[PDB]
Amino acid sequence: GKVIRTLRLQKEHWKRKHHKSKGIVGFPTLKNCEATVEKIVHESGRPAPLAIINYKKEEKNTKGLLVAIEGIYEGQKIQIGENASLELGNVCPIKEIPEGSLVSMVEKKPKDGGKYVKSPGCYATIVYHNKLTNQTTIKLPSGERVRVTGESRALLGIIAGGGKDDKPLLKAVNAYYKYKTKGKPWPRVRGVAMNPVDHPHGGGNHQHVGHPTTVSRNAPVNGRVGLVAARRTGRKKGSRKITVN
RNA sequence: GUUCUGGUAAGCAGGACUGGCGAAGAGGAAUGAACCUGGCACUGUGCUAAGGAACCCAAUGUCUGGACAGAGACCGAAAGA
RNA sequence: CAUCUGCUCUGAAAAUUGAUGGCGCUUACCAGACAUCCGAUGCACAGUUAGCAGGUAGGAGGGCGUGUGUCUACUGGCGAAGGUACCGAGUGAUCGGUGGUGGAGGUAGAUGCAGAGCAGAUCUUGGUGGUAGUAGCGAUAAUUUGUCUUCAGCGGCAAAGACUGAGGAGGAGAAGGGUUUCUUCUCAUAAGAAGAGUGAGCCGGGUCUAAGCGAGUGUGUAGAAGCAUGAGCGAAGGAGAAACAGGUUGAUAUUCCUGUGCCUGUGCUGUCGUACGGCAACGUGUAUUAGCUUGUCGACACGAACAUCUAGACAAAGCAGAAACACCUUUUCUGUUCAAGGGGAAAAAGACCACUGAGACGGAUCAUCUGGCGACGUGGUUUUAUAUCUGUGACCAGGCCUGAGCCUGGUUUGUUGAGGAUGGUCGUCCAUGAAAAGACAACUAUAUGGCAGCACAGUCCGUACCAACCGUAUCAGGACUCCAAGGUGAAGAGCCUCUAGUGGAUGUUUUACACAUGUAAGGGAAUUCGGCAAAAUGGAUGCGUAACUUCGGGAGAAGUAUUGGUUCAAUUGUGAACUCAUUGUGACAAGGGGAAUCUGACUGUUUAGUAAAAACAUAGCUUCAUGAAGAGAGAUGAAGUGAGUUCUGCCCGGUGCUCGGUCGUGACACGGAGGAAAUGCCAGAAAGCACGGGUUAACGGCGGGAGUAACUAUGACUCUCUUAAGGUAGCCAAACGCCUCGUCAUUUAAAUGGUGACGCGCAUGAAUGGAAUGACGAGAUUCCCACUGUCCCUACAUGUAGACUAGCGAACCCAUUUCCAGGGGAACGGGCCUGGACGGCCAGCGGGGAAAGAAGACCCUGUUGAGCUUGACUCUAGUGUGGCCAAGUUGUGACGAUUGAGGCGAGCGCCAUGAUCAUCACGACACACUUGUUUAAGGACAAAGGCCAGAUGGGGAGUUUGGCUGGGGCGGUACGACCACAGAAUCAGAACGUGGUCGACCGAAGGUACUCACAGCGAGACGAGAACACUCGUGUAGAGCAUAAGGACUAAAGAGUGCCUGAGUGUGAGCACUACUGCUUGCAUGAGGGGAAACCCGGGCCUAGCGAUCCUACGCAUACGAGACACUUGUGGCGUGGGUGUCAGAAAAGUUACCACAGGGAUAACUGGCUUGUGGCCGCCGAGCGUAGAAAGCGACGCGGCUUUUUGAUUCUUCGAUGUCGGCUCUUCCUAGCAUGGCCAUGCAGCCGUGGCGAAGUGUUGGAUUGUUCACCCACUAACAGGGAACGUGAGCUGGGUUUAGACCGUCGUGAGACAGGUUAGUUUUAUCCUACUGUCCAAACAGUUGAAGGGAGUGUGGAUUAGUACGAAAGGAAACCCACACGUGACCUCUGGUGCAGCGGGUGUGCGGAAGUGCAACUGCCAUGCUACGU
RNA sequence: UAAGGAGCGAAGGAGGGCUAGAUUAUUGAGCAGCGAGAGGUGAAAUUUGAUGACCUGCUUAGGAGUAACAGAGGCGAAAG
Ligand SMILES: [K+]
Ligand SMILES: [K+]
Ligand SMILES: [K+]
Ligand SMILES: [K+]
Ligand SMILES: [K+]
Ligand SMILES: [K+]
Ligand SMILES: [K+]
Ligand SMILES: [K+]
Ligand SMILES: [K+]
Ligand SMILES: [K+]
Ligand SMILES: [K+]
Ligand SMILES: [K+]
Ligand SMILES: [K+]
Ligand SMILES: [K+]
Ligand SMILES: [K+]
Ligand SMILES: [K+]
Ligand SMILES: [K+]
Ligand SMILES: [K+]
Ligand SMILES: [K+]
Ligand SMILES: [K+]
Ligand SMILES: [K+]
Ligand SMILES: [K+]
Ligand SMILES: [K+]
Ligand SMILES: [K+]
Ligand SMILES: [K+]
Ligand SMILES: [K+]
Ligand SMILES: [K+]
Ligand SMILES: [K+]
Ligand SMILES: [K+]
Ligand SMILES: [K+]
Ligand SMILES: [K+]
Ligand SMILES: [K+]
Ligand SMILES: [K+]
Ligand SMILES: [K+]
Ligand SMILES: [K+]
Ligand SMILES: [K+]
Ligand SMILES: [K+]
Ligand SMILES: [K+]
Ligand SMILES: [K+]
Ligand SMILES: [K+]
Ligand SMILES: [K+]
Ligand SMILES: [K+]
Ligand SMILES: [K+]
Ligand SMILES: [K+]
Ligand SMILES: [K+]
Ligand SMILES: [K+]
Ligand SMILES: [K+]
Ligand SMILES: [K+]
Ligand SMILES: [K+]
Ligand SMILES: [K+]
Ligand SMILES: [K+]
Ligand SMILES: [K+]
Ligand SMILES: [K+]
Ligand SMILES: [K+]
Ligand SMILES: [K+]
Ligand SMILES: [K+]
Ligand SMILES: [K+]
Ligand SMILES: [K+]
Ligand SMILES: [K+]
Ligand SMILES: [K+]
Ligand SMILES: [K+]
Ligand SMILES: [K+]
Ligand SMILES: [K+]
Ligand SMILES: [K+]
Ligand SMILES: [K+]
Ligand SMILES: [K+]
Ligand SMILES: [K+]
Ligand SMILES: [K+]
Ligand SMILES: [K+]
Ligand SMILES: [K+]
Ligand SMILES: [K+]
Ligand SMILES: [K+]
Ligand SMILES: [K+]
Ligand SMILES: [K+]
Ligand SMILES: [K+]
Ligand SMILES: [K+]
Ligand SMILES: [K+]
Ligand SMILES: [Mg+2]
Ligand SMILES: [Mg+2]
Ligand SMILES: [Mg+2]
Ligand SMILES: [Mg+2]
Ligand SMILES: [Mg+2]
Ligand SMILES: [Mg+2]
Ligand SMILES: [Mg+2]
Ligand SMILES: [Mg+2]
Ligand SMILES: [Mg+2]
Ligand SMILES: [Mg+2]
Ligand SMILES: [Mg+2]
Ligand SMILES: [Mg+2]
Ligand SMILES: [Mg+2]
Ligand SMILES: [Mg+2]
Ligand SMILES: [Mg+2]
Ligand SMILES: [Mg+2]
Ligand SMILES: [Mg+2]
Ligand SMILES: [Mg+2]
Ligand SMILES: [Mg+2]
Ligand SMILES: [Mg+2]
Ligand SMILES: [Mg+2]
Ligand SMILES: [Mg+2]
Ligand SMILES: [Mg+2]
Ligand SMILES: [Mg+2]
Ligand SMILES: [Mg+2]
Ligand SMILES: [Mg+2]
Ligand SMILES: [Mg+2]
Ligand SMILES: [Mg+2]
Ligand SMILES: [Mg+2]
Ligand SMILES: [Mg+2]
Ligand SMILES: [Mg+2]
Ligand SMILES: [Mg+2]
Ligand SMILES: [Mg+2]
Ligand SMILES: [Mg+2]
Ligand SMILES: [Mg+2]
Ligand SMILES: [Mg+2]
Ligand SMILES: [Mg+2]
Ligand SMILES: [Mg+2]
Ligand SMILES: [Mg+2]
Ligand SMILES: [Mg+2]
Ligand SMILES: [Mg+2]
Ligand SMILES: [Mg+2]
Ligand SMILES: [Mg+2]
Ligand SMILES: [Mg+2]
Ligand SMILES: [Mg+2]
Ligand SMILES: [Mg+2]
Ligand SMILES: [Mg+2]
Ligand SMILES: [Mg+2]
Ligand SMILES: [Mg+2]
Ligand SMILES: [Mg+2]
Ligand SMILES: [Mg+2]
Ligand SMILES: [Mg+2]
Ligand SMILES: [Mg+2]
Ligand SMILES: [Mg+2]
Ligand SMILES: [Mg+2]
Ligand SMILES: [Mg+2]
Ligand SMILES: [Mg+2]
Ligand SMILES: [Mg+2]
Ligand SMILES: [Mg+2]
Ligand SMILES: [Mg+2]
């Protein structure tokens, strides 16, 4: 047969375009700074708003981008790095923040610029500090617990734009605007409605799959469709998670 | 043509024996691949075959019995007056 | 009288008109005989001749002709070759001469070399016919008259008549074209030839940057591709310094000329400058370069309402000129202009500054709103149009003259108003709506800078025209944009007009059949698969509006009434009166409505060119995988179901996916033992596999049999088999039910239909999603109201073609000689045989030419393909897993490998610890390697490369998927062997002919020598019987012989008993159609067997139990071995084993309804032919039955025929094509007689019937369900018989069924896919030829006639009278003449319907100044003549 | 007013909402010790354990609850 939809959309001419982008998002590199928030802006592909910051490096003014936490305003002064106060919207070394606190834009290793929590409405929880090893345990929004060194930086607050998934998209055109900038195929034609030249689920005198939909992790790429390496299937209840800090 | 097997049968399917048409014209059965007479270079005079002999159409008449049905010369059964 | 033989007779019915061959024959027949004649390529005689002589496929011998070579002989201007008429020679292929034409070359003989002879190939190229002066050439607005040319153009010009109608058939640009544009001449004309024509600082290109492309460099490659970075490039419609009027040419113009300007720079001469004002909001002053830095401009979505301006359009008055006047009118028409640049208001809308000090309150918008972070008020500051003036006069209208110049006007007011411009507000979004070049301000330094005059400069390329573009063209198609008047009306709708633009194949009143349209008595879907098509409804205003519903909707529900003109009131609500001959959204424009069911939630999308859908999408719901990112779990990808409401039961046995451990297996490397060494051997061994768990909103799956309740039925209850679990809740003859047209109710006169119920449901059912509704479908289906030419049943009229005529002018197709009936024939003839008939012409028509299209698409065959699937065969990319490979450095412990000095148990193995090399975790440093944490972080790990080895692998690649066969498939095996039967008494001998057997078994069931029988039957012998052991007599096999069938065997070949391993070893010859195989037989040998010996034995009493080349295993002796020699491996020879059952021997699964190619009537799906089982119809006999009684009527059990209208059986004709079911329409034939006419019998009183005979003239209907033929009901009737003609009839129609490609359901399949199972959507071409048929002319002067031959026509019902009569116990109950009607036939318009071309009238919208006369769009009342039936 | 509402003074109660903490217990994982049974009942079987259960240590992760004191005691319109 021919090449399936899933492979074609991974070729280079289909990658997302950057022409409307504001810049690369991430923290400054300097040990200490005082910054001012210049503007709060929407960026074409992203639902969380961005804040433009201004800080001096040598004598010269320089500009950066952060993801906005909820409760900043244009004109606010913010303090970055060691010796910053625990005030909403400051950036601090993680070892300085008390247990049970909520944080965003956490660095996985020092000076990486911030990864981890970046989507609207999300946060992470500080669950443990180890005074020997200088590690800290953070609980991520998937439920995963990960350990990071005390020298990493983090932003104090919750990411702006929460609640967005409460309102249903009642019409086809509303879905159109949401997926127009994403990589997923919309509208999505079902594999059982294709001919066998186009998809492993195609063909036959009734619309059916005909073979089990759970497939191996090591299966060849042009036929790896369906539920890939599923441990279980169906709507029944699972089992207890195992937890360590 | 003579015989045989399967089949209700068939211008049906399949064997055996002796001549044909295929690869065979000519005269005769009104017409017909295979039936009757009889096997072909080219001319001329006579004679016969098979089949014909009121007329179409070259050659026809005679004797003795049957037969009356728009019958027969071409043409079907068991049963009958 | 009884039998037998001959001829006649009865049994004896088929579809166009018919066949002893015809006409005829009764003395042309049947049977028995007789005469002699006619008749072959045969026979006789005679010529010619080698004479011995037919011939496909095929084979051989001898000759004729063509282009060129070598030689010999000749020839041509006193006319060569060629070509054309005649004449001679040869059986023939061919050859020779004569007379005209032609104008320079040509042969005869013998040999040599070959591109060496045409009727055909749907042959190749070129040229020409018939058809044929024919088919056609005419969609759109429309044309007439005069006059000149033209020389014969509806060409030009005047006057009329029309049309596009400002979302134009008008005026311009772009893409595309490229001289098509202008002048002259000529026909050569959508034709040529010769010239001429496009002028810029201010218009556009050359500039900037979007999405993006990229030279070079780095890395890579055999060279490439690719990847990282990046000079340069990227928009004639995005950003982008500065121009406008009026004139002029045959053709250019914001480009030329005149006038008035502007931008960017340069230089001269004058003339001034080095600062101030306001509480403030800010002003006055035309101001230099340069630089940091901060900001602004360039610089931006959609939608709605409200202001203001400008084009435009109206109406009054003034003047100037036009139109109209039988009448009337100060009625009607055209005009009344002002650019860029300069100067400049009031106004409206917002910002802001000073004083002031406000509320349970003031201000303010069409709408939101607004104020102590300062309201109202009073005075100011600033930003954004426009009117008006100047632009020095141009331009327009009119008058007077004129081959030129003068003169006069261009004045005032009101209403409205963009489809253009601008301003400040408001709404929407999980969508927030480009960059850069180039500018400007503030701040800091620095200063000869501003203005006026005059002068200079600004390169290069494009510039004509389009009705001329793309479609083979002068093609009804396609193709990016701009400007836009008046009336009617909501409206750049339709209809009518102003500005501007427009047109030719000719004449004829022109039948039939058409194509676009009108109208119709009475009836109203009776029509048809089906209301398909048409009709009906229609705008605005008011009254009045149901079920159900997600509460939004349904809803314009439905149902009803009103509407013109005039003259008034009243001011947006509307009222009232008067008036008209059909009435008023008058033309144009403009919904039919209701009740239910199946199905998809909705708007949206799709097979360009047969499918618009129930299919796809969609919002919502659920599952899965991941912490990797230029992205970071409200994320990023993969699947399934299909909005909302309400539910979503049970199963982890199989298959898959996933998790955990090894107990076993499982590669290469790395080790070990041995040997002179190679080859082998042993250990070792990840992941996988196996094993144990999880998982169905994963693939999917979800039962049988017996009994049992006070009538019968049914079974809550019991028992029994069975499993992974035995279909829960719901729903149903449903788009899913075979039987099936299921049963009951309702709808109709009548229901293979619809709806409601019921349910052991062939084969319903839960995100392979189940069930009940709303709103919305060019979706499928049933019914009702309105409405109608769909129909009964057709008639009349209009336009355009068509017929005839002038001008112009083709194609398909074609072996062609073409009237029928029967016969035969390749089984349906135009041509052949025997009969019936025989002409040409013009216009129509569709019976035939199995008419033309196109090497049948269905079906089979080919050792021909391609797309797609998987549990087919053999490989492969990707993904995982192991060991090894760039000398990192140094610590600690550990297991392991190798050998000593210790200890235990009757020097052994076992237990202690001490030295020698690898080596697995763990630490701590920095040097390889990694990362924009980069003057940095990690770190010998990772990540990325390389060489070998295992695992997985329809993600892909190649290929295969036997044969015979009363077509193929499914089934069997007639595919290798053996016996019997038949195949007309040797042997042989076919069919999916008949009865069967084989793929082995046995140390004896083999070899030998000797002994004796057997199966039974008749007597006996205790328990002891039908049947126990023992005896005597008979006993030709009635028994046995392992295993089919046949043959064979008696002191044995059978049953016993003894001994043996001949079921030896070498090597020959033969038989069975004889290779393999099986058997028969010769000679030589054994320290061979059995027997006294003669004799016998190298398997089974005889006929069946089996297999090549190459490779490999074993036995046997004799060989070979590379320069030489020794050994371990190897190679030769003979013979046996390991195996091919498709058995004279490839290594192999499906599907195509998406389909291709070569062929086949060697072979299926129609018709026809032969047959007639089965279907249908008729005879013979007489057992019984009929109230008696064989036979009025019947007729068992048996027996003989006919028919082709049923279905089989067979494969003769057609696969380079004979259009396939039913209906509609129309004609003819058959009889086996339903009605109607004449008769005979009766169990015939009469009435009504029943059985038969001669007879085919005239009849045999309207409907409901269904695609039906068929069936079954209702209504009528004299009666509602049965059939044929290529299952009559598609260049006659229709297209409901079946049977291409889309899609749903059930059952089957792991799947792609299947299903004489159900459902819905699905392109019907061409006559102009010949012949037939129908009419028309000629053959046939004119007037009056004749009648050969051909055609043919009237059929039936009722009433009255006989008569309440005959006849019958009664009840009942018949038989001419006359009159009324229906169907059919032929005519006719006096009457009555219908139609409206000629004729008279009326109104609506808009044109010609009014009235009168009238155009266009079309509407409407009456109606001559004519034609017609619903009339006579 | 030994009718009602407003208010003052000292005090009492498991009455209610919110914020920040707590001693144990029941399960689950990690690691260590030991080496055969644990559980459950009237009596037993399903079941789990040499992949080391049970019991005893140390670590951790969660989500409920407030024993004994505690009563013919208190509070609230009732539910509590
Ligand atoms: K997308
Ligand atoms: K499909
Ligand atoms: K499928
Ligand atoms: K499905
Ligand atoms: K299945
Ligand atoms: K032949
Ligand atoms: K012969
Ligand atoms: K003859
Ligand atoms: K024959
Ligand atoms: K004669
Ligand atoms: K005759
Ligand atoms: K005779
Ligand atoms: K030829
Ligand atoms: K030939
Ligand atoms: K018009
Ligand atoms: K733009
Ligand atoms: K000039
Ligand atoms: K516009
Ligand atoms: K130009
Ligand atoms: K108008
Ligand atoms: K109007
Ligand atoms: K207009
Ligand atoms: K209009
Ligand atoms: K109907
Ligand atoms: K029907
Ligand atoms: K139709
Ligand atoms: K309600
Ligand atoms: K309705
Ligand atoms: K009306
Ligand atoms: K109309
Ligand atoms: K739909
Ligand atoms: K719509
Ligand atoms: K549609
Ligand atoms: K699913
Ligand atoms: K979905
Ligand atoms: K549902
Ligand atoms: K299972
Ligand atoms: K399973
Ligand atoms: K049930
Ligand atoms: K059913
Ligand atoms: K029925
Ligand atoms: K019914
Ligand atoms: K089922
Ligand atoms: K099911
Ligand atoms: K389920
Ligand atoms: K539709
Ligand atoms: K006419
Ligand atoms: K004409
Ligand atoms: K015949
Ligand atoms: K025949
Ligand atoms: K014939
Ligand atoms: K013919
Ligand atoms: K015709
Ligand atoms: K015809
Ligand atoms: K380090
Ligand atoms: K370093
Ligand atoms: K460091
Ligand atoms: K394949
Ligand atoms: K056969
Ligand atoms: K035997
Ligand atoms: K050697
Ligand atoms: K050598
Ligand atoms: K072998
Ligand atoms: K074979
Ligand atoms: K398909
Ligand atoms: K047939
Ligand atoms: K055919
Ligand atoms: K058809
Ligand atoms: K009769
Ligand atoms: K008749
Ligand atoms: K047709
Ligand atoms: K005369
Ligand atoms: K006559
Ligand atoms: K009349
Ligand atoms: K009339
Ligand atoms: K007009
Ligand atoms: K409290
Ligand atoms: Mg596939
Ligand atoms: Mg489905
Ligand atoms: Mg002959
Ligand atoms: Mg003679
Ligand atoms: Mg020959
Ligand atoms: Mg040659
Ligand atoms: Mg000459
Ligand atoms: Mg040749
Ligand atoms: Mg004509
Ligand atoms: Mg018109
Ligand atoms: Mg118009
Ligand atoms: Mg138009
Ligand atoms: Mg021209
Ligand atoms: Mg310009
Ligand atoms: Mg450029
Ligand atoms: Mg531009
Ligand atoms: Mg011009
Ligand atoms: Mg200008
Ligand atoms: Mg031009
Ligand atoms: Mg009518
Ligand atoms: Mg009427
Ligand atoms: Mg009908
Ligand atoms: Mg219709
Ligand atoms: Mg229903
Ligand atoms: Mg739609
Ligand atoms: Mg189509
Ligand atoms: Mg269509
Ligand atoms: Mg769907
Ligand atoms: Mg749903
Ligand atoms: Mg619910
Ligand atoms: Mg049904
Ligand atoms: Mg019907
Ligand atoms: Mg029903
Ligand atoms: Mg189903
Ligand atoms: Mg004939
Ligand atoms: Mg063919
Ligand atoms: Mg073909
Ligand atoms: Mg073959
Ligand atoms: Mg192939
Ligand atoms: Mg291919
Ligand atoms: Mg396989
Ligand atoms: Mg075959
Ligand atoms: Mg024996
Ligand atoms: Mg022997
Ligand atoms: Mg063979
Ligand atoms: Mg045949
Ligand atoms: Mg028969
Ligand atoms: Mg027939
Ligand atoms: Mg044809
Ligand atoms: Mg043919
Ligand atoms: Mg035909
Ligand atoms: Mg008769
Ligand atoms: Mg037919
Ligand atoms: Mg026909
Ligand atoms: Mg159809
Ligand atoms: Mg189909
Ligand atoms: Mg359709
Ligand atoms: Mg008229
Ligand atoms: Mg333990
Ligand atoms: Mg307590």
Highlighted features:
1 chains, four-stranded antiparallel sheet, about 240 residues, ribosome, RNA-binding, mainly beta, binds magnesium ion, globular, binds potassium ion, part of a larger assembly
Question: What does this molecule look like?
Answer:
It is classed as ribosome. The entry lists the keywords Microsporidia, ribosome. Spraguea lophii ribosome. The protein: 60S ribosomal protein L8. It is built from two helices and twelve strands, in the order αββββββββββαββ. A hairpin with a 5-residue loop joins β8 and β9. Helices cover 5% and strands 27% of the residues. The strands form four sheets. Strands 3-2-1-4 form a four-stranded antiparallel β-sheet, with no helix packed on it. It is mainly beta and 245 residues long. One potassium ion binds next to loops. It binds three RNA strands through β2, α2, β11 and β12.
